[PDB]
Write a protein that binds this ligand. Structure first.
Ligand SMILES: [Zn+2]
Ligand SMILES: [Zn+2]
Ligand SMILES: [Zn+2]
Lengths: 151, 94, 128, 50, 150, 93, 81, 97
RNA sequence: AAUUUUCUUU
RNA sequence: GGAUAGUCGGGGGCAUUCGUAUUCAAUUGUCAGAGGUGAAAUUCUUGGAUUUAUUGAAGACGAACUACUGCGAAAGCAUUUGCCAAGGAUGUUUUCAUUAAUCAAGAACGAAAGUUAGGGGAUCGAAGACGAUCAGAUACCGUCGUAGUCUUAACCAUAAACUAUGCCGACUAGGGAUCGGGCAAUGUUUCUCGACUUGCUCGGCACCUUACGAGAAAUCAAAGUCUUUGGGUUCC
């Protein structure tokens, strides 16, 4: 989602306002006989920007499992949530919105979460389901000129 | 580890000073390492005790809880305002 | 790149179907036609024929402006209700496709609840 | 009043600048800062009567 | 058949048939007895005495080498606590529950557990008074339970 | 001896003014004539004087507190204090 | 079936049963003497130890207690007897 | 007599279970007693694929679907014929046909 | 949607 | 009974965090119907209804994941985190040594609804108001709607409170799933552990077949070991 902020030569300029996942994709991802772990954390950039980012991940089979349950204990769920919290904080300690967008498209948050969850249930389909924006800067009236003006 | 257990085992094997007048005497004599100040302490008295400990190079801990809680932690049935641990014994209070 | 993209909301309720078409933004909409102004029987508002009549009337009024492609978004009653699109949703989709207007980015945006408030009926429910 | 966050609980509020307290002066009563409006600065408040 | 629960667990320790000192050991009996005395002065319960001796020092069962139970050894050498270990642990648990309840009065589950612990303590105290381990006027009061523990 | 089944402090009112009114007054006066703890001295010596003023005696902490009509602190004031504390933290941070 | 020798059950049929459920209940644990990798003293330890074991000489932790058999991480050439 | 061994719902090791609302009549039916079906329907009918393709963009994009969980009561399920009355011998089977 | 009633016996 | 080690739990309480949905409020865009129903009808809408878009507030609840799965003595317990007390099973060559089972009298908890005071009242909704159906509808249907639905401090104390099946203990047939723990694998896999696979065992939730056996039968691994009638103990 984008928020239109500035007008330049009868050509409006927008800014990043958040990301989400389609209902069809979310319903397809949600499945029975598996454990879903969803967590959230609030992050801050170098400038004034409060972003509440969510993440959701599902348990996965090992291509040799015979049973059909594939469930994880609540202690392992809490350990997974801690691993997601640590990964989010480490990867978002100092990024700013430019790096946030540059790192959400290649899906590095989900990859790092899955890598960190090697010692726990392997987990799968880890992705940021929704990012919400709570605070905004002073319209960035001059930083928009700094970023734009090319082509 | 927590500090209530550490305070209890210093009580079993250690040297403690109760109250304000005796705490001032211990700080004045210099045989003081740690002072514990309750959250219900008078602000003027707390500033005076902090100044005394800064002069005598003694550590200060203004732990949470009222003087009733400090006395209960100390194992006494009366209110304790200022604690002065002179000998830690076999603990790591200091 | 001589195409203009709008946003076509479809509200497929079991009593009446809404065919709302706006610009790429949300405000400053252009066309809003339902089955009530296409059939006057007070019974076939949600009928597929009435839905397709409203959909094709919306297509004609949009072609009047000159907009070519629409991002479609169908949605049911949602909330604490049936949450299933009515029969007019597919009829409106086919009517827009047949009218010649381009269709893109099909999505369902029905409002789902996270265990919202109590539904009416009174425990025993609507004993019709 | 304009320098307080929305939803704060206050008392002895002035109807005008320099009034020195007019609203919410009785015992147990208070005024709630409902919202602010910077353009021609004005603050909307909720009185004890509602 | 748990006394205050529906569990039917059978977890326990199965002592060996050979009621003899270990074939390969050099406990020397008296050395272990003084070792238990040293640990008793250190202030650990007889259960901790056996656990530490079995896990670390390598004596499976102390009575096999010593000839008497460790509680008997402690009583014989004078380091016999006035309150039995099981009763002391039960009263300490009751004190902790009571402190939790007095700080948080809404814990009905804790109140129910306190009732169970109180009943268990009274039954154990009655047994100990009957056998003679405690004075016949022992009694149990919640007000002085904290002083009893400490 | 119990000396009173249920009226308690309202036994001075005899049989008049109604049972419900006497019960409401009984609850209010029980709250009113109660010793409270000074939040700065830790002593149960706070007593009410003139409907909103609470004072505790002693050599120290002779403070006079502005409280409720018959309780030192009211639920509404505590909720307001928490709300103001929350708002102040958000503004500061 | 319907005719068995309960006096002398098979060893394989006994090692697969619970310790209590055996004909004569017995322990399933043992003691082993381990040697410090950088010393010469030998210390006996229990297979189901519930406490942190420290060698007599200058050495670090020996094994970590767990629900079942504790894991040895020091390079000790243990002899079990 | 007990018509069903499970009393009509999956309640073993429980004392109380939350109740859900029927889609049709909005009756309060327990979670373990509600008949659950999963409608997985393409967002358009199979007869409009050609029309959508001839009027679409994005170079053969994937057509989404909708996933709806339907929880019927006993009376509504029987009326809707999703679940049917069976013989006494056939009542003891749970594998879908 | 909507559908109430079938005297005492042979 | 107690202690100890790794665990496990939608067990309890306190503080804290997040989610959409519902209703309402303000603002912006075109216009004629919108709700609802078998059909309708009440009601409100060129004064802008409904819809769409932005922001905010209130209260309630934790969808999907969610299962012939878990926990608790039961009633019941389902968002994140932290704290506190406690609990079952498992492992144990740890501790005490009969401390045990069932109970009159007496006590703790006890869904929902109902009561007394304080706060809050979004949704639903007893009473009620209208509008349709019917011969009469006083009801079932639509909208609105008070108490109530939330919570604190005091009350009571019952439900098809059910497994219509008291508690403890011994024995009894074949198999396969599932939860928690433990044991074993010169087993597999992923940058020393986890996940998966196999076998054994303990304690639970259950399931299929069968009837040595029981019942009047429906049916029951207990409701079997009862005319071959007696392990112990309460309620009725
Ligand atoms: Zn004072
Ligand atoms: Zn060592
Ligand atoms: Zn239904």
């Amino acid at each position: 989602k984008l928020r239109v902020e500035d007008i330049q030569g009868k050509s409006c300029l927008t800014s990043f306002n958040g990301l989400s996942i389609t209902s069809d994709k979310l319903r397809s991802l949600v499945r029975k006989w598996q454990t879903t772990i969803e967590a959230d954390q609030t992050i801050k950039t170098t400038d004034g920007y409060l972003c509440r980012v969510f993440v959701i991940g599902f348990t996965r089979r090992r291509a040799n499992q015979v049973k059909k349950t594939t469930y994880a204990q609540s202690s392992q769920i809490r350990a997974i949530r801690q691993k997601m919290f640590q990964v989010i904080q480490n990867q978002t300690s100092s990024c700013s919105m430019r790096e946030l967008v540059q790192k959400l498209i290649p899906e590095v948050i989900g990859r790092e979460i899955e890598r960190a969850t090697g010692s726990i249930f392997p987990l799968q389909n880890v992705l940021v389901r929704k990012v919400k924006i709570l605070k905004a800067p002073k319209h960035d009236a001059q930083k928009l000129l700094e970023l734009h003006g090319e082509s | 580890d927590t500090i209530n257990a550490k305070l209890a085992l210093t009580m079993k094997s250690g040297k403690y000073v109760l109250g304000y007048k005796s705490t001032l005497k211990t700080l004045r004599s210099g045989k003081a390492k740690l002072i514990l100040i309750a959250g219900n302490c008078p602000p003027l008295r707390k500033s005076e005790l902090e100044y005394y400990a800064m002069l005598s190079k003694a550590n200060v801990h203004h732990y949470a809880g009222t003087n009733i809680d400090l006395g209960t932690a100390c194992g006494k049935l009366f209110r304790v305002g200022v604690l002065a641990i002179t000998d830690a014994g076999d603990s790591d209070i200091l | 790149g001589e195409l203009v993209f709008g946003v076509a909301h479809i509200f497929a309720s079991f009593n009446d179907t809404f065919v709302h078409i706006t610009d790429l933004t949300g405000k400053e909409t252009i066309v809003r036609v339902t089955g009530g102004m296409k059939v006057k029987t007070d019974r076939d508002e949600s009928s597929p024929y009435a839905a397709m009549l409203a959909a094709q009337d919306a297509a004609a009024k949009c072609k009047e402006v000159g907009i070519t492609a629409l991002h479609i978004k169908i949605r049911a009653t949602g909330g604490t209700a049936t949450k299933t699109p009515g029969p007019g949703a597919q009829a409106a989709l086919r009517a827009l496709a047949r009218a010649g207007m381009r269709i893109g980015r099909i999505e369902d945006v029905t409002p789902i609840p996270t265990d919202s408030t109590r539904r009416k009926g009174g425990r025993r429910g609507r004993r019709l | 009043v304009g320098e307080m966050p929305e939803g704060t609980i206050i008392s002895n509020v002035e109807e005008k600048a320099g009034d020195r307290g007019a609203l919410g002066r009785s015992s147990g009563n208070y005024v709630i800062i409902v919202g602010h409006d910077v353009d021609t600065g004005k603050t909307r408040v909720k009185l004890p009567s509602g | 058949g748990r006394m205050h629960s529906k569990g039917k667990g059978i977890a326990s320790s199965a002592l060996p048939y050979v009621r003899s000192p270990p074939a390969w050991c050099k406990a020397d009996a008296d050395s272990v007895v003084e070792q238990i005395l040293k640990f008793s002065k250190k202030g650990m319960s007889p259960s901790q005495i056996g656990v530490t001796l079995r896990d670390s020092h390598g004596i499976p069962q102390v009575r096999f080498i010593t000839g008497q139970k460790i509680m008997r050894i402690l009583k014989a050498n004078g380091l016999a606590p006035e309150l039995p270990e099981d009763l002391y642990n039960l009263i300490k648990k009751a004190v902790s529950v009571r402190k939790h309840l007095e700080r948080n009065r809404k814990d009905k589950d804790s109140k129910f557990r306190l009732i169970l612990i109180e009943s268990r303590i009274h039954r154990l105290a009655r047994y100990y008074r009957k056998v003679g381990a405690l004075p016949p006027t022992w009694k149990y009061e919640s007000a002085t339970a904290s002083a009893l523990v400490a | 001896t119990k000396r009173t089944k249920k009226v308690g402090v309202t036994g001075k009112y005899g049989v008049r003014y109604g049972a419900s009114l006497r019960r409401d007054v009984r609850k209010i006066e029980v709250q009113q004539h109660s010793r409270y703890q000074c939040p700065f001295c830790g002593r149960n010596t706070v007593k009410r004087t003139a409907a909103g003023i609470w004072c505790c005696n002693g050599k120290g902490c002779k403070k006079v507190l502005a409280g409720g009509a018959w309780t030192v602190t009211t639920a509404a004031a505590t909720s307001a204090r928490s709300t103001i504390r929350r708002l102040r933290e958000m503004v500061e941070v | 079936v319907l005719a068995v020798d309960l006096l002398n059950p098979s060893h394989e049929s006994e090692m697969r049963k619970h310790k209590l459920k055996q004909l004569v209940q017995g322990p399933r644990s043992f003691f082993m003497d381990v040697k410090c990798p950088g010393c010469f003293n030998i210390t006996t330890v229990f297979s189901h130890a519930q406490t942190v074991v420290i060698c007599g000489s200058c050495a670090s932790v020996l094994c970590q207690p767990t629900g079942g058999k504790a894991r040895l991480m020091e390079g000790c050439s243990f002899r079990r007897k | 007599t007990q018509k069903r061994r499970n009393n009509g719902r999956n309640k073993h090791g429980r004392g109380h279970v939350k109740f859900v609302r029927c889609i049709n009549c909005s009756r309060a039916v327990p979670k373990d007693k509600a008949i659950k079906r999963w409608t997985i329907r393409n967002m358009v009918e199979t007869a409009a694929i050609r029309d959508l393709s001839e009027a679409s963009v994005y170079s053969e994009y994937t057509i989404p679907k909708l996933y709806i969980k339907l929880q019927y009561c006993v009376s509504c399920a029987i009326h809707s014929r999703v679940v049917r009355v069976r013989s006494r011998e056939g009542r003891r089977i749970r594998t879908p046909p």
